[PDB]
Structures are given as structure tokens and as C-alpha cells.
Symmetry: D3
Subunit: 242 residues, 6 copies
């Protein structure tokens, strides 16, 4: 957490408000931001100053997507693949099964690549004024990285295809309708609502909370006979490590 | 199989088998005894000509308060491992193994409290009509346990990842209208109209061809993990099997 | 495209209005229509006069499902070939069509019509449209690929309710359960559908085709595999553009 | 109380023998019900820590009963079909104790499912295997088609399903149907030595390990690592 | 009227011969279209109840035509050409209405692995030379060759020959489960004809249902496969 | 320090360097081996990596003292140490940017199976001893060992050696598909070098794309694999 340039961490009574911090660039996710975000999230897993992580963006943006210059334009094949993997290293590899509960607080512009860490977070609270967009089609690219998969994970096929194919923007209430976020409230109540939800998660047994939210995503592709076998081993693991 | 029941009641009604958990003093908590009796009841009703549809509900003010904290959890905590496994299997033996592909159509009538383990038989049933006043809750997190058995899988089967994680992680209660919005139940109506609405839907299912109704509702849950090429092959055999056994 | 007997095709500023043309039979899908529809869909994938295809029904019916007279009632391998020819255009060709597809449900949509409706990329229904999985009322299961198609876009509760009950529902209910993207009054159906088609026509056609395919491809994949596939898909997109 | 099954206890080994030699150990609804009772009773019988499945006489099992199971209502037929698979693979494939199939002779049709659902299998060289269902005008129903595909390659599975051609114990070993094939005179002792080897292991760890192998097969590597981490913790918490 | 494929009928056996010996039976877009028409014509031709796929001359097939298929286009046209190959190589062949046997009489390289593996069975000559030689030409085993080899061979053997491009004979192909049997070339035709006659003696409806069910149940869990096999058995008895 | 790296005309001989501990994989070695693999995938002096062990061992498995006993630690720390093992043993190795060959020169037990199987190819010495000895130590084959064995071995062979913990040599490892080839130890180094030189003669881009494509298409249906392989082939030509 020392010498961060693109990421801000503010601790608040057990809550780690992690803000993408490139407001002048609308929090576009560059290779520098990708490296810092993984370093922050890895450190916060063992930082006792927090038991829940809130992911948001500084200024009027959640995130305008990947940096069109520093991530896309300025990027050898193996060198290119390493930078692409560094994005997914924190956007979904670390976030999807994160050690502590995660809440995405969408305060504003959320486009393209921003959908992957938003969906990899366990919960999401958006502002009514927040503007979501799968604008990749308008920039001549598909929703790569894991954006296409992430949208398919939480939204129905009809809604996923409509916003990928058309690139049409939509607000927080529409994001809640299609299952992209858990709740949409006015921006003036966004932080208060997200903080109340984080405080509710802080009141739970942290081990049981971690085991339960992981098991939900693990059992998704399993058959019912396999899920019962996994959940039984997961329940015994929970009581053994608490 | 229907005689000497201590925790479950069965009442026949014009081709409907109203199966209600019968431990109201315990809010219909599901004990190992109840898990054993319900499997007996559901197995017998699959061949009982007095029914063409099964309605699963609870006596009193509770649909179910989840697994018995005393008889299912506490009294089996220090039991031998294979004994605990057998008790756990017996719960899922009727909660999802029997219910999810029951030979007859099943409707879950959520008349009241529905917590924790009660979500698995509720979701394993084909259709679900809840009361607006009913209170749902994945309160396992507040008791220090994960939603085990098959509760976690059952919730992810009908509810989106956001709604599934929200109520699993927060343990927050919600009513029948929220259960309908998140896809947990088909319909939500006031409690005063819950039985008449459930009975009307049950009579609608009774008016259908029972063989085709059984075959079609099973095929829906079978084809979900299949690719479209495999599902077309399975639906072709399922359609031929339907015509041969009708 | 020449000599068609059950399908009509009208070109409109890059839009291929493909209508099932059996209105006196409520656009029931016969083995003849199944053969012609695949014949038309294969030709339109390379027809430079179209960049988007709108599937709709002539008259008051989008489609009344499979032809109860020419398809169902009328050898095992012969029966299998006729059944396969239905899915050949209803999902095999439509689900990963080389061009964007929009289903315009102008009226009756029952049984087997669900498969090409769901295999299309997008769907705009009329509020007055009447959907229904009435196969249970006819004594059959939603065969072909209907059960899978309904499973693909609707939640398990909604899918089971309409399959088991055979209850009909309107355009707004179809939009609510995720069967279609939007639902407008019939008087505004063609204008809204043409507006959506022009929006798709303004996109990069190669990127649009690759993106709509990638969405349906990554669904059964794990996140590690989908990231690998999307990286290869993104590279294929830039190379063939 | 059993009429179709014989159980012999030997130093922690429960020798479970199919006992219908007059019908070549064909599996009837009576045998299917009796076998589930035996397996359910043996999983808590402390007198055994390993179960060996074999057949009395010159047969392992000639498949399902052509008369009782097949020739003799829709949901009644489905119940009898489910009773066969209830013990043939639902109970056996994840049985609480290690299981060994000892193929002493004829092994045809439906016999493949309990043979494959068992953890391990030792065959006699003189034993004759055969997916002869095609010769009787039926497909390998129940779960035989799935069971054969689980242990043998697609080529070997298709060859013996489509041709109905018999093969011996050495061929069964080569295609992976059984772990080992020895002469019949050495079959029981080789099986008993393997059963004794399994009895020397930690029973909890052995049950957990053998279950974990079959569970992780359809998992991706990221998910299997998560499953194996919980399975190992579950192992240490109950041992 | 066919130019690249030859069809000879023999007592219910349709000997289908790839016929481009001057190009070592390389598969061109012309051959790909002709093979699909032959397969679509033979599935209802009562002169055959079994299909034997092989190659004329000293070749089975040297893979895809390096000139006509790869070297000699717009994106959708190249995809249509690519789709036409898989249309007969695996889409039609993998679930073909009639039993299929691949007779590997000679060279079998690259893209030839897909129709070889999509056929139900395969008998090779010991002298036949196999090879996933795409790596030697600077391309991955595209089409469905990578999946086909993954379907019948273990991961070690699949990776070894994909990565090394090293050739191997008929006995090695039998060892790794690529073919069911390998015999001397002088005995290949009679050994293949005997297997074809063995398939012709089966109930053709039951044979088609069983060979399809084997490949359908591969990715199913055991509970789902039992559900599918019960429906497949009822469909078999009805048709 | 715990790893040795020797460059040889494009070959990166990567040796586990804890011979006094039989190359037991400590948390120290786990972190160091990941850095070596990360450094080599961008080191232009190598186009192939051979993973072997110093001394008489390939690897005796995980360090019983430093990896297991000394982590007896809070749950998240234990999970972090466990994840660091799989970070290089399969997360980095299974889809490594360059071809990998495991040279099993000696003892290969327990956790050593995971990096052995995550390597693309493997050549063993006949004299080398292989063992899934976890059952003898009271633990299940955790990490990804159970999944790795199931990935390359049949269910029977996987279950036999997990349940019995029985040791086996290089020829048996080749017979069950654990390694590609087994030769006498005196010929092991040159046989592995021939394979490494063969891999070095291939287009490294096409070789990486092809070897990755094989493992990616395993769980796909044939229609999905064809779509993936077409994009993979286009990605190959563009890169
Ligand atoms: C997010 C957005 C609506 C904000 O609107 P705005 O308040 O008017 O701010 P601006 O459009 O003027 O851009 C703000 C700055 O941040 C940069 N910026 C915005 N989004 C960026 C992105 N993905 N990548 C890199 N830079 C970005 C701009 O280049 C600009 O830089 P500059 O001030 O040095 O010239 C608008 O910037 C936008 O549409 N960005 C692209 C969103 C997107 O489509 N992402 C997916 C790309 S595939
Ligand atoms: C369902 C509930 C809201 C009803 O509240 P109520 O009407 O006021 O009734 P009570 O709380 O007084 O409980 C009545 C009886 O039923 C028992 N009971 C209720 N739920 C029970 C359960 N899962 N298991 C065992 N007993 C239960 C009570 O212990 C009590 O028994 P007692 O009278 O002998 O003391 C309440 O019982 C409850 O909060 N929780 C259990 C629900 C739950 O969270 N289950 C999952 C736990 S993992
Ligand atoms: C679609 C429907 C609501 C239209 O009702 P309508 O305007 O009153 O039209 P009609 O019912 O009078 O029938 C119109 C004609 O189209 C035919 N038709 C309608 N649906 C048909 C279908 N699936 N298959 C074959 N013919 C059909 C009728 O047989 C009739 O032919 P005819 O006039 O030459 O005798 C009506 O046909 C219906 O109730 N059901 C359609 C069938 C259906 O549900 N199919 C899925 C079944 S598996
Ligand atoms: C196993 C077999 C090779 C033994 O040959 P054998 O020593 O000559 O024994 P036989 O066939 O002469 O007779 C054995 C008795 O057991 C019965 N039997 C053998 N297999 C049987 C089976 N699946 N089901 C019912 N009865 C069977 C015979 O009907 C016969 O009864 P009977 O003596 O009262 O007339 C031979 O019996 C056989 O082929 N059985 C069928 C194997 C098979 O195909 N199973 C799959 C069926 S789909
Ligand atoms: C099959 C093979 C071993 C036989 O070699 P041979 O008997 O000595 O005879 P040739 O090598 O001269 O080949 C004979 C003709 O068929 C052609 N031929 C062989 N394989 C061909 C292929 N895939 N595509 C197109 N033409 C091919 C040759 O170009 C040659 O053409 P020509 O006679 O007009 O000059 C050799 O031709 C060969 O290696 N072919 C390539 C196999 C392969 O790698 N396929 C995968 C390609 S990615
Ligand atoms: C590999 C093996 C057969 C070699 O036998 P050996 O040549 O006679 O060598 P030794 O047993 O005498 O031990 C050599 C050293 O290496 C260590 N060693 C060997 N395997 C080790 C392992 N997994 N972990 C930690 N140390 C190990 C010994 O503790 C010993 O250290 P020390 O000399 O400081 O006391 C033997 O070490 C063995 O049987 N098992 C090691 C672990 C194993 O087999 N499986 C993993 C258990 S889960």
C-alpha cells in the first residue's frame, strides 16, 4: 500500500474502500493500474484493518474500461499476452474467489473492461446515475479479457447480447433489472447504502462468510450429486478452520 | 408407508396429495425422523392412484424452519463420521433426489416461515406458490454454518448469482414478493388466497396428460447442462419414449 | 431465393425481411418450409444486399409451431431426417448465423416457433403477440430443441410453469421472463425492429459477428478457459477484419 | 435371509458372492433388492473394511435376468430399472468402503456396471467378457454404456458394444476394464492380497482418496484444486 | 459422376474409397463436398448396411489438400470452405445412421485423423504410417483434428504426436487406441470385411442406437446417462 | 538456489536442486521454481524446458517437514502456501509458454506427480520408482495430484495406485500413460535430448498454440471445439 499512484485505499472501521484513482483519465485501467490493483488486493487479504473490501472509482467514474492508449494501443505476442493476463490477474482471478467479501460500488461511468471486476465482486450496489456500457463494439473490438464471460455469468442471454451487440448505455436501475447489480439507489445514498451492507457482512463469521460465498460460485457447473459431495466437504472444512 | 407417521401429514383432495410437514411446535424443523418419513411418503405417493399432483407445505405458521438444530445438527455432531454421512444423505434423499425428478408434478406452497434447509425441497419441487406474508431466509450464516446439504446448489439453480450471494452472505429475510422477483417461486399472493391459488394450479396440472407432463418437466431439468446438439438428441429419444409409454 | 413457395424475402437498405409465408396455415412449419428456410438462410449469409436478417411471419402469425398435418402426423431414418431438417435452420444455422438476426414476433408464437425465436440474436415482440408452449395440451413434449431453447433464456421456474401449464402469455410477459429483448405495440413493432436493425448495421460487421458468437460460446466454459478462448477470438477478429 | 447373495467374513474381507448359479448369476429384481440390502448393511458392519464382489460357480454374472428383469406399467418398470442401478452404481461407485470385483467367469451385459462401479477389479484369464446386448436386440441400457465409456477408450467401448464379441481377462486388462488378470487358480489369493493391502490403509483416508479420484474427473483444474483442498481438510477433521 | 471418391457395393458393404492417388488422397474442397453427398446418399441406400472408409492406392489420406484447401479468400468464404470439411469428416460421420469402419491402408496424416476417428471403428495395416504432421507444416491440427485425437487417445500420446510430428505405424496406433486392430496389409481387407460382416449380422436399428449412445453419454454424469439410456432404450424398442 | 538451470543449444535443463532431501518440494522451492519458470518463458536462450531432478531423485514429493509439518498456521496462510505449490506445479506448467519435458531420472512420489503431469511430455527411466504414497502417510493426494493422475491415467490405474500406494517402475508408468516413453537410465538423458531437439525444430508459435489447444479442447463438445480451433488457428497465423 506504499507509493500507490493509480489506486487509493481508505480504511473505515473494518471497511477497505479501494478506489481506482485515475480520475483525469476516468479511471481507465492501464498496465500500471493492473499491477497496483493486484498488489493492493493481495495485501488486503492479510491486512487485519479490513474484513470487507469495497471497490469503487474516484471522481465521476467507476471505470471507463481499459486504457485505450496504455493498455490497448501501446500493446511481441508473449509480451502482449502477459499484459493481458495481468489485467485478469486482479479483475477476476483474485476478485472472483477473494479471501474477504467484496462489494462493487458503481458511482458513475462503468464501460467495457470495468464489467469484469464489477462482476467478479461478490455484491454490487450501483447509483441510479451510474451509466453502464458494453461499448467495445463501437471501438471495433469484442468484449475480450473476461468481459464476455463475466456478463454471461450474471445476465440473461437476451440482455447480454443486446448490450454487447448494440453498445447501448443504461443506468443503474436497468443494471439491477438485468441482474448486473444487487441494488440501485441515488448517488447521494450510495455510500451510506454500501457502508451499511459492508457493516452487515462484517458482523458475520468471517470464515463461514468466506466459505459460503466461495461455495456458491463453485457449485454452479456441478450436477446436484456432485454439489452435495462438495458442499459436505466444504461444510467440514469450514468447521475445521474456524 | 402412510401409517404411523409421526412428523408428516397427508390429505387427499380430488387427485391432490397435500403433504404438510407436521412439527408445528418445532416450526416444521426437519429432523432425521422427518427425513426418513418424508422419503417413505413421497415414495408411496408416486404409485398412489389417489393423487396426480403433490403439494408440499407446512402445518401451522411455518412452511419449514430449516434442519432441526437439535435432532439433525446437535445430536449428530459427535456421531461417527459414516453415521453423520448417512444422516446427511437421508435429508437429500427426499429433499432433492426424490423431489427434483418426482414421477408426479410437485408444487411447493410456502405458507409461512421458510429458512435454511427448506430452500432445497422448495426449489426441487417443479412449481412454487408463496404467501406475500411468508418470510424467507438463508440464515445459515447467522448460525455459523454454510448452506450445506444442497441448499447452495438449489439457490444457484433458480436465482441469479447476485441474488444468490446477497441472501446467502447477508442472511437477510425477504417476503414472497421478493421471492417471486428473484425467481425463487413462481407466484406470490396474499396468504388468504394461497391455498385456492395453489389448488387452481394443481387442478390445471391434473388436467394435463400425466405421462407427457412427467416427461416434459423432467426433460427441462435434464437438458440444461447439455449442448444444443446433445439436447436435440436427448429430446428426440425423450419424445419417442413419451409416445411409447403413454 | 427463386421459386420459394412458403417463405418471402424482402431487401430493405441492408435488411433482409425474411417472413414465413403460410398465413392461411398461421405460418405452420412444414418439411417444405424447413427445407426452404435453410435454403434461404444459407444464401443470405453471403448475399451482399443484407447485413442483418429479420425473421417474422406474414399475416397475424409469427408462427403457430410445427405443421400438425405435414410435420408430425405425416421409417425411423426418414422421420429422423425430417426432424433434423427442422433444427437445421431453426437453431443449427440461426444460433451462430454469420450475420446479426432479429426475431420480430408479430403475432401467434407457439411450440416449435420458440426455437428459431430463441436461436436469433435478438427479439422484438408485439405486446399483442401471443406466446405459448401448448405442446402439453396436444399430448407431446417440447421436442426438437424447444425445451433446450426455453431453458437457454428463461429461469427454471418460468420455464417449468409455461411448459407444464401450456398457459399463453403476451409480449410484455415474454419481455419480463427474458424470452425477448423488448415488447412494443404492434403499430410500432416494425419501426422499432427496423431501428434496431439499422443500429446493428452501423456496427463493424466482423466485430459484431465475432462478439455475438463469443457470448454464446463462453457460457459452458470455466473462467480460465473463457479467457483463453476470448483472447484467441479477439485475435481472430482483428485478423479477418 | 438372503436367497440370491452369499456373504462370507474373512479377517475384515466381506466376500459378496452372486448366488444364482442355476441362472449363471443373472441379476433379477430379487437379487437387485437383496444386493442393496447387503451393501447398506455392510457399510456399517465393523466386521469388514473391504468388500469383494464376485460370483458363485463358474460365473461372475451373465447380465440382467432375461426373464425376471426384462421379459416379466411405466412407473413400475422405471422403479425396477432404478432398483438395479440403486446398487449397481449409485451405492457401489461411491461406496463407503473399498470394493474389489473378482471376475471368476462369465461377465456379460449388465454385469459390467457393478464391475466398473467397484473401485478395483481382478479378473481370471479364463473369464469370458462380453457386451452381448446387441446380440439380444437391445442396447446396453441401465448404465452399462456409460460404465464402459468410463474405464475404456472410445474405440474399445464401441468395438465390443457394436460387435458383441467376447474377450478374456487379459484383453479386459489391456483395455483397462480390470486392473489385473491372473490364472483362475491364482485369482482369489491375488484378490485377497489386494484386499489385505487395502485393509492396511487408514480407512478414512482411503475412502476419501478413492472418492476424490472419481469426483474430480469432470472438474477443471482450478475447481479440482478447490475441491481437493476441502476434501483433505474434511479428511483430517473426521480421522 | 464423382471424381474424387469411389463407391463399391459388396454384400451390404459400401467400400468408400478416397480417389485422388496422384495427390495421395489429399482432401480438397471438391472431395469434401463429394464425400458429404456420398454419405448422404448411402444412409438411405439399401445396398449397404455398413460403410468402410478407406483410400485408393498406397494412401488412406495425406490430410487436407495443401494447395486446393489451404493455399487457394473472404472471411465467410474461408469459413464455409472450412465448415464443408467438418460437415462430412465429423458432423455426418460421428453420428452416422449406419456403422462405419475406417480401413487405414496407407498414409494417414493430419486432417485424415478426423474422419478416421469419427468413424465408429478402425482397422489399420501394420505398414500404414500415421502422423500428426501439421506442426511440420507450420499449422496447428485445426478443423477438429485436435479434438478427435483427444477423443480416443490419452493426453500423453496425443501431445507427443501433435508436438513432435513424429510418424508411427499401425501397431503403435493400436497401442494408443487410435484404431481397434492392426494387421499385415495382406490381411487388412479380409479382416476389415469380417468385421463389416459381423456388423451386418446385427439388428441395424439396435446397432445404430447403441453406437450413438456410447458417444452421447461420454460427458454425462452417471445420473444423467442413466436417464438418457432409459429413454434411448425405449426409443430403440419403439423404432 | 533450490533449482539448477543449464542452457544447452536451446534446451533449458531445469533441475530440482535439493538432493540431500531427495528434491523434496519446500515452500522455498515452490517460490523459487515459479520465478525460474517465469524467467525462462521470456529467456530467448531457451525454446524448450526439461524438468528433472538432481541426484538419484526426480522429486520425493512435498517437503514433509517444511511444507506439511511446519504449516500445521492460520487457515489463510496455509491456503497461501498450498496455492504457491500449484502456482508452478500446474498453474504455470500446464499451459507454459514453451514446450516442457519431464525427465524422471529417479524417485518420483506424491506431489511430484503434479508437475510431472503438467509438463507437456515425459520420459522416464525404467529403474525410476514412482509412487502415490500419500495413502501410506495418512493423507489423500491433495494439491492437484488426484486431478493430475486422472488426467493422464485411466480410472482403474489411477484408483489402483492411489488406493494401494504400490510403487511401480518406468515401464509400468509408460504402460498406464503416465509418461510417453521409458528407457534405461543410461539412455535417459540422450533420449530426452532427442525429443527436446525435435521440439526445438518446430515453429515455436505453432508449437505453443498446438500444445495448448490439445488441453483446452478436452471438455468441449465437438461443435464448440471446432469453433475454438478455427479461432486458435487464426490466432496462430496472426501471431
Ligand atoms: C467515460 C466517458 C463517458 C467520460 O466522459 P467525459 O466526462 O466527457 O470525459 P472525456 O471523454 O473528455 O475523457 C476524459 C479523459 O480521460 C480519457 N479517457 C476516458 N476514457 C478513457 C479510456 N478507456 N481509456 C483511456 N483514456 C480514457 C480521455 O482520453 C481523456 O483524456 P484527456 O483528458 O487527457 O484528453 C468518456 O470518456 C468515454 O466514453 N470513454 C470511453 C468509454 C469506453 O467506451 N470504454 C470501452 C473502450 S473499448
Ligand atoms: C422460524 C422462527 C422465526 C419462528 O419463530 P417463533 O414463532 O417465535 O417460534 P420459536 O422461535 O419460539 O420456536 C418454536 C420452537 O420451535 C423450535 N424451532 C424453531 N426452529 C427450529 C429449528 N430449525 N430447529 C429446531 N427447532 C426449532 C424452537 O427451538 C422452539 O422449540 P421449543 O418450543 O421447544 O423451545 C424461529 O424459530 C427462528 O428464528 N429460527 C429457526 C430458523 C432458521 O434460521 N433455520 C436455519 C438455522 S441453520
Ligand atoms: C394459432 C391459432 C391461435 C390461430 O387461431 P385462428 O386465427 O383462429 O386460426 P385457426 O385456428 O382457425 O386455424 C387457421 C388454419 O391454420 C391451421 N393451423 C393453425 N395452426 C396450425 C398448426 N400448428 N399446424 C398446422 N395447421 C395450423 C389450421 O388447421 C387452420 O387450417 P384450415 O383453415 O385450412 O382448416 C390457432 O391455430 C390455435 O389455437 N393453435 C395453433 C396450434 C398450436 O398451438 N401449435 C403448437 C402445437 S404442438
Ligand atoms: C453365460 C453363458 C455363456 C453360460 O453358458 P452355459 O454354461 O452353456 O449355460 P446355459 O446357457 O446352457 O443355461 C444357464 C441357465 O441359466 C440361464 N441363463 C444364462 N444367462 C442368463 C441370463 N442373462 N438371464 C437369465 N437366465 C440366464 C439360462 O436360461 C439357463 O436357464 P435353464 O438352465 O433353466 O434353461 C450363457 O448362458 C449365456 O450366453 N447367457 C447370456 C449372456 C448374455 O448375453 N447377457 C446379456 C443379456 S442382454
Ligand atoms: C504422403 C507422403 C508421405 C507420400 O510421399 P511420396 O509417396 O514419396 O510422394 P510425394 O511426396 O511426391 O506426393 C505425391 C503428390 O501428392 C501431393 N501431395 C502429397 N500430400 C499432399 C497434400 N496434403 N496436399 C496436397 N498434395 C499432396 C504432392 O504435392 C505431390 O504432388 P505432385 O506429384 O504433383 O508433385 C508425402 O506426400 C507427404 O508427406 N505428404 C504430406 C503429409 C502431411 O503432412 N499432411 C498434413 C499437411 S498440414
Ligand atoms: C525417496 C526415498 C525412497 C529415498 O530413500 P533414501 O535414498 O534411502 O533417502 P532417505 O529416506 O534416507 O532420506 C534422505 C533425506 O531426504 C529427506 N527426504 C526424503 N524424502 C523427503 C520428503 N518428502 N520430504 C522431506 N524430506 C525428505 C529425508 O528426511 C532425509 O533427510 P535427512 O538425511 O536430513 O534425515 C525416501 O525418502 C522415501 O521413501 N520417501 C520420501 C517421501 C515420500 O516418499 N512420499 C511423500 C510423502 S506424502
Amino acid at each position: 500500500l506504499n507509493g500507490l499512484t493509480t489506486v487509493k485505499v481508505q480504511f473505515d472501521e473494518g471497511i477497505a474502500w479501494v478506489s481506482l484513482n485515475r480520475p483525469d483519465k476516468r479511471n481507465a485501467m492501464s498496465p500500471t493500474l493492473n499491477r497496483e490493483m493486484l498488489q493492493v488486493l493481495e495485501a488486503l487479504e492479510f491486512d487485519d484493518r479490513c474484513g470487507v473490501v469495497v471497490l469503487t472509482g474516484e471522481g465521476d467514474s467507476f471505470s471507463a474500461g481499459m486504457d485505450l492508449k496504455e493498455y490497448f494501443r501501446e500493446t511481441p505476442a508473449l509480451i502482449k499476452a502477459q499484459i493481458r493476463r495481468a489485467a485478469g490477474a486482479w479483475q477476476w482471478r483474485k476478485l472472483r474467489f477473494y479471501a474477504k467479501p467484496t462489494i462493487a460500488m458503481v458511482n458513475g461511468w462503468c464501460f467495457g473492461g470495468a464489467f469484469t471486476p464489477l462482476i467478479a465482486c461478490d455484491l454490487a450496489v450501483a447509483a441510479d446515475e451510474a451509466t453502464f456500457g458494453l461499448s467495445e463494439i463501437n471501438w471495433g473490438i469484442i468484449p475480450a479479457g473476461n468481459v464476455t464471460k463475466a456478463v454471461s455469468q450474471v445476465c440473461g442471454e437476451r440482455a447480454a447480447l443486446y448490450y454487447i451487440m448494440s453498445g447501448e448505455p443504461f443506468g443503474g436501475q436497468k443494471a439491477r433489472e438485468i441482474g448486473l447489480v444487487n441494488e440501485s439507489v441515488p448517488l447521494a445514498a450510495l455510500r451510506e447504502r454500501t457502508r451499511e451492507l459492508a457493516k452487515t457482512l462484517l458482523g458475520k463469521n468471517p470464515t463461514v462468510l468466506r466459505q459460503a460465498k466461495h461455495a456458491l460460485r463453485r457449485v454452479e457447473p456441478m450436477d446436484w450429486d456432485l454439489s452435495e459431495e462438495y458442499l459436505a466437504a466444504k461444510a467440514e472444512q469450514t468447521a475445521a478452520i474456524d
